[PDB]
Design a binder for these strands. Structure first.
Ligand SMILES: [K+]
Ligand SMILES: [K+]
Ligand SMILES: [K+]
Ligand SMILES: [K+]
Ligand SMILES: [K+]
Ligand SMILES: [K+]
Ligand SMILES: [Mg+2]
Ligand SMILES: [Mg+2]
Ligand SMILES: [Mg+2]
Ligand SMILES: [Mg+2]
Ligand SMILES: [Mg+2]
Ligand SMILES: [Mg+2]
Ligand SMILES: [Mg+2]
Ligand SMILES: [Mg+2]
Ligand SMILES: [Mg+2]
Ligand SMILES: [Mg+2]
Ligand SMILES: [Mg+2]
Ligand SMILES: [Mg+2]
Ligand SMILES: [Mg+2]
Lengths: 140, 62, 141, 100, 71, 140, 184, 70, 81
RNA sequence: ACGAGACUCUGGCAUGCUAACUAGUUACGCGACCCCCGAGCGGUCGGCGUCCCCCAACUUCUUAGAGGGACAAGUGGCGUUCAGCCACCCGAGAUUGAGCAAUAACAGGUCUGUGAUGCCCUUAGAUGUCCGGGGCUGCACGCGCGCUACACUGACUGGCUCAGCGUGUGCCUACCCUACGCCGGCAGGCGCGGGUAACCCGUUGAACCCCAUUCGUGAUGGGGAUCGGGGAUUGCAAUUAUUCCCCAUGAACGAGGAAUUCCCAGUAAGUGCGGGUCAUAAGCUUGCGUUGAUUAAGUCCCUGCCCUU
RNA sequence: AGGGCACCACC
């Protein structure tokens, strides 16, 4: 049980991300942008994966099931309020954006705000604080 | 020189720049005579036993 | 004769939770695998069967002190909320969790609504808890 | 007869106690079953404020406080007799509330 | 330099555990981790397995410190 | 009907022990004396019984009701109340010699078993976070 | 009824070799207690701390730094586990190990820096500084290390009792006495 | 410090000079006598005066005292 | 008709600080010299039976620069209950 | 003679006094549950009731009035043997903490607290007053008070178990504290009650702490800045994010140079809770408890202040 | 030149 298996994977590649196999699975899939601790735990609960095993101990079928549930949360009764992209301003769809998708979403949001020349977009463009913080003394 | 044990028989008074040291008179335990004057750092009172690593020196009023 | 107050309370809670799970008539909400138990928590409970433990704890609290409502339960299960770079403060538990636990215990007929408001143990619930306490004492001895 | 509750409230302990003692002495003289003066916890109203009218100097504070003392007396007597007993001279600063 | 501990036993480390560890006077997860270059979780699990098999004896158990000893 | 009710104090914690003629029961808030938390300080509660022997307590039942203060203060209040209750029961329903000897044992071991510690929290004063500490002073 | 610390460690067999410190290490007879938690007023008057049991003085000195201030239950648990570890490692009485560690850690000569001049050290300050050095060594060994604080305290006490140079307290005492000798 | 002020000392000296025959070495009896024969506004002041009276009575028994003329 | 007002005379006009302050105020408004008015009030207070009194008048008494004149008599306490 | 002291408030003691259904205890009666065994005058009950047609005694615990109590009083030592100092016994206590606070001053602050006020200025295109919008928050930088941290004497997830101070529905005046039931994952929403308060919130189930769990020395499950998306609440109005909630993002920081602050006992420090501000509301302040030390009982070396020549 | 005092001084 405590001896390392022959199929143990030191490094996994999931969604163009290097997942360390030495970490526990829940805190190992948090290496993916868009997956935090809460979302990782709920995904693994939906996937019926034992939380006590390391990332390398997972089989290929288990990894594939985890990836599928991660990329399609709504099909597995993961509630909308759990998602980091709710009611998208362009499509109105609920989803969980991950990794390059998350980066593209951030760039698109900033580009839209700058294109309409909203105040927050201008603050982002100038590189200043955008949530009303004082800038006189901090942020140097 | 062997380590010596002395017994405080009288607390003379405070000494040092900030008054941190206490000047006392000690009588040797090996020989009841040969009482000398020593400077002690820390709270000391009559009847305490000091361990003199060098028993030849004298306080000389610090 | 053994009553609840005669035994170790943590061991009693574990035994009562095991008893409730083994009986298997306790109604469990569909969202137990998704929620966290309070806004001051950072993660969902480690134990998959946290609902049975919470129900056993609630029943023990009602045994010790009857007439407690959902607000009292949320006060009981409240804790410290850390606020990032701001100081920490007391925070209450999940009202839905407390209410569902109380309703499930009522469904088991171990809990009934008190006349003056809140909930209390039925004689059947008191009997069940005293039997569990006797089992805990026997196991310890 | 009716059960009469007299609630006395004051900021002066000495005058409050004098009034309570006089009321109880009157009730005893009229030969009435009187429950002794129940003393409610004293209330301490506090106002803490900066001493300075401006914002200058060492930040010193004034701690003003007012103390309110409350007493309860229970009687079993007719309303007319209770009113006659309460008709005695009441020291200034004592507020009396009679309930039947 | 950073110490790279093992999350799971290899054959040599497992044999070294099962051979030498039941002979220590003081057996704690921290000392076992330091000696065998394993993580604290692996050390705790291994010591629990040894206790279950009866190779070592439990002296004290606490949420912050667990102390075992040789039989 | 032989009984006494004796209190013990520590900070704002107050424990009243009712000691009556009995068979050797000792309870605190209805729980056995060995079940009171925190159990790090269980010997503090057991000290009166360990010092005097179970034979002294074999003839009395003592029930302790404690409230106020914190965990440690309640522990100290409970032990003081138990000791004082046994001393009072002995001095009232037994000879003075037994009371004197048990009181001497308790006093020799620890005076706070019979005499309350009068220390109380000191009031905060303006200009600092507490009773003595002052706010930091700057010059330039 | 013999009183044993934590119900395990007896005080009757504990011996204090150094006669200068015998009046400042309260360990046996009237100073034998079940727990190192008395809530006593030892700081009320001068020298009264000499009556405080030495285990309780160690427990008090373990409540550092600020984040651990006032957590005497935690330090009591730490001391209990450290004594258990010491007994497992040495087979001796943990009280005897603690007494030997304090005796070996107390510096006997110091320098007062009035250019510095050598002065003697009173027994009470010897005990105080020995406890301070032992706790400081344990704390610094345990910081940012998987080794627990109880294990670090046990190792520090064992090394100090043996007089080994692996002990932080022994090294600090040697440095202090060497500087005092130089300024003598 | 426990230095008694001129108020205490002068009151004690006058009390001794006027009522020496009723005073003794017992603080409690002296305190009762002082509260009987003098108007002292506060209990603490009465206790201080009685204590110094007792001290001076011991001194007077041991020998003459300059301040007091009996 | 619920509220009724009555008027009464102060028993010892010389011992009322408010009455004496108003008297001094109207003497000063009447053009009387500061020293004369203050000493008159002081003498009246002392003759009224007071243990002591203090009268302080502050402001531009003479010229533009402001100052205060204090007139004290008898015994006066400052500290304590 | 003022100031000091005395004084007032506060803390600690009273099984002595006064006396309480807006505080309780004990006893008894009824009820619930456990033990057939050893079933009892048993154990647990913040379950109900016992002046309140009539059915029980008391004040230890709580409240708060009166009085008492401590005086360097007793013993030993030092001292001119005075003033007083040190130690010890008995004792709740042998230095609790505050408030008040002299003469004489400062061109100290405040005319932005005032229907306090001299003079000057302005007074209808107003420096009056109201309304709308913006600003007071603006960010290459320097400084001060602070909060959160740098982790394992820890973080996380469960379980268990303890406070005290005090506020609460308002002249104008809109705005109170909230139990319980139901809906929602949460912030919240709906219904229905109590409290103008020792009566209801409330036995104020506080946090730290305690017991287990997972993590394992890795800028890591330490830290939580910054930032995206969504949901609520206050408000006439939330953009320059009011506040709150959810998912996500995951910066510096590995204990801090010269320098420097505060502090000696229930103190420092840790920890939470009230009050003020408040429609919305604490990283501030003013109080409260809880856990609870190391060091010292000294000196004039530094910084100052004071006295004498 | 000498002597006092203070954790808003030091030790
Ligand atoms: K460590
Ligand atoms: K003004
Ligand atoms: K003006
Ligand atoms: K003005
Ligand atoms: K202003
Ligand atoms: K104002
Ligand atoms: Mg992630
Ligand atoms: Mg909690
Ligand atoms: Mg504090
Ligand atoms: Mg005076
Ligand atoms: Mg004064
Ligand atoms: Mg009473
Ligand atoms: Mg000026
Ligand atoms: Mg501003
Ligand atoms: Mg964290
Ligand atoms: Mg990280
Ligand atoms: Mg402010
Ligand atoms: Mg300074
Ligand atoms: Mg310093």
């Amino acid at each position: 049980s405590l001896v390392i298996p022959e199929k143990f994977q030191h490094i996994l590649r999931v969604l163009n991300t290097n997942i360390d196999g030495r970490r526990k699975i829940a805190f190992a899939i948090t290496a993916i942008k868009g997956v935090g601790r809460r979302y990782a735990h709920v995904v693994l609960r939906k996937a019926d994966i034992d939380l006590t095993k390391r990332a390398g101990e997972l089989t290929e079928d288990e990894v594939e099931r985890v990836i599928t549930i991660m990329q399609n949360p709504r099909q597995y009764k993961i509630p909308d309020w759990f998602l980091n992209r709710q009611k998208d301003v362009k499509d109105g769809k609920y989803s969980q954006v991950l990794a390059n998708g998350l980066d593209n979403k951030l760039r698109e949001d900033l580009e839209r705000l700058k294109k309409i020349r909203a105040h927050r977009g201008l603050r982002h463009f100038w590189g200043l604080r955008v949530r009303g913080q004082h800038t006189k003394t901090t942020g140097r | 020189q062997p380590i010596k044990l002395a017994r405080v028989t009288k607390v003379l008074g405070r000494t040092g720049s900030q008054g941190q040291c206490t000047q006392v008179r000690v009588e040797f335990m090996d020989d009841t005579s040969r009482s000398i004057i020593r400077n002690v750092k820390g709270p000391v009172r009559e009847g305490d036993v000091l361990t003199l690593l060098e028993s030849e020196r004298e306080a000389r009023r610090l | 004769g053994v009553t609840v107050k005669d035994v170790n309370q943590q061991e009693f809670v574990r035994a009562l939770a095991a008893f409730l799970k083994k009986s298997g008539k306790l109604k469990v909400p569909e969202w137990v695998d998704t929620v966290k138990l309070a806004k001051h928590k950072e993660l969902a409970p480690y134990d998959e069967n946290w609902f049975y433990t919470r129900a056993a704890s609630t029943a023990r609290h009602l045994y010790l002190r009857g007439g407690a409502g959902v607000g009292s339960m949320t006060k009981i299960y409240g804790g410290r909320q850390r606020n990032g770079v701001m100081p920490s403060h007391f925070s209450r538990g999940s009202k839905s969790v407390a209410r569902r636990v109380l309703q499930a215990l009522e469904g088991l007929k171990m809990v009934e609504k008190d006349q003056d408001g809140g909930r209390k143990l039925t004689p059947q619930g008191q009997r069940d808890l005293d039997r569990i306490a006797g089992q805990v004492a026997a196991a310890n001895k | 007869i009716h059960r009469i509750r007299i609630t006395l409230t004051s900021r002066n302990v000495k005058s409050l106690e004098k009034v309570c003692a006089d009321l109880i002495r009157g009730a005893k003289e009229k030969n009435l079953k009187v429950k002794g003066p129940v003393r409610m916890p004293t209330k301490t109203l506090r106002i803490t404020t900066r001493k300075t009218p401006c914002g200058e100097g060492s930040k010193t504070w004034d701690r003003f406080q007012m103390r309110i003392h409350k007493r309860l007396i229970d009687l079993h007597s007719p309303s007319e007799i209770v009113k006659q007993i309460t008709s005695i001279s009441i020291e200034p600063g004592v507020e009396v509330e009679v309930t039947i | 330099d950073k110490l790279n501990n093992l999350v799971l036993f290899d054959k040599a480390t497992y044999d070294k555990l099962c051979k030498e560890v039941p002979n220590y006077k003081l057996i704690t997860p921290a000392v076992v981790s330091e000696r065998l270059k394993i993580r604290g979780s692996l050390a705790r699990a291994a010591l629990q397995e040894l206790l279950s098999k009866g190779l070592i004896k439990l002296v004290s158990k606490h949420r912050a410190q667990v102390i075992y000893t040789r039989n | 009907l032989q009984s006494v009710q004796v209190f013990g104090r520590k900070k704002t914690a107050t424990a009243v022990a009712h000691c009556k003629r009995g068979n050797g029961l000792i309870k605190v808030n209805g729980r056995p004396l060995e079940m009171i938390e925190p159990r790090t300080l269980q010997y503090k509660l057991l000290e009166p019984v360990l010092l005097l022997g179970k034979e002294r307590f074999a003839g009395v039942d003592i029930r302790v009701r404690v409230k106020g203060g914190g965990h440690v203060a309640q522990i100290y209040a409970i032990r003081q109340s138990i000791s004082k209750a046994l001393v009072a029961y002995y001095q009232k329903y037994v000879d003075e010699a037994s009371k004197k000897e048990i009181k001497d044992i308790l006093i020799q071991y620890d005076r706070t078993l019979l005499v309350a510690d009068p220390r109380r929290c000191e009031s905060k004063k303006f200009g600092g976070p507490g009773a003595r500490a002052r706010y930091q002073k700057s010059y330039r | 009824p013999d009183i044993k610390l934590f119900g395990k460690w007896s005080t009757d067999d504990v011996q204090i070799n150094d006669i200068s410190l015998q009046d400042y290490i309260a360990v046996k007879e009237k100073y034998a207690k079940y727990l190192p938690h008395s809530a006593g007023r030892y700081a009320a008057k001068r020298f009264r701390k000499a009556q405080c049991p030495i285990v309780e003085r160690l427990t008090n000195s373990m409540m550092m730094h600020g984040r651990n201030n006032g957590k005497k239950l935690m330090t009591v648990r730490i001391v209990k586990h450290a004594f258990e570890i010491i007994h497992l490692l040495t087979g001796e009485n943990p009280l005897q190990v603690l007494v030997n560690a304090i005796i070996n850690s107390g510096p006997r000569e110091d320098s007062t820096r009035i250019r510095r001049q050598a002065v003697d050290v009173s027994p009470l300050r010897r005990v105080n500084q020995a406890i301070w050095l032992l706790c400081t060594g344990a704390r610094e060994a345990a910081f940012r290390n998987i080794k627990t604080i109880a294990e670090c305290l046990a190792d520090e006490l064992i090394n100090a009792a043996k007089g080994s140079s692996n002990s932080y307290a022994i090294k600090k005492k040697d440095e202090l006495e060497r500087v005092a000798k130089s300024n003598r | 410090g426990r230095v008694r002020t001129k108020t205490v000392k002068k009151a004690a000296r006058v009390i001794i000079e006027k009522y020496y025959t009723r005073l003794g070495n017992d603080f409690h009896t002296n305190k009762r006598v002082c509260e009987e024969i003098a108007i002292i506004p506060s209990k603490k002041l009465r206790n201080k005066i009685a204590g110094y009276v007792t001290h001076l009575m011991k001194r007077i028994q041991r020998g003459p005292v300059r301040g007091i003329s009996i | 008709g619920s509220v009724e007002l009555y008027a009464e005379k102060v028993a010892t006009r010389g011992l009322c600080a408010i009455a004496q302050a108003e008297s001094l105020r109207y003497k000063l408004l009447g053009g009387l010299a500061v020293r004369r008015a203050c000493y008159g009030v002081l003498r009246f207070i002392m003759e009224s039976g007071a243990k002591g009194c203090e009268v302080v008048v502050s402001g531009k008494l003479r010229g533009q620069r402001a100052k205060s004149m204090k007139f004290v008599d008898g015994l006066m306490i400052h500290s304590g209950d």
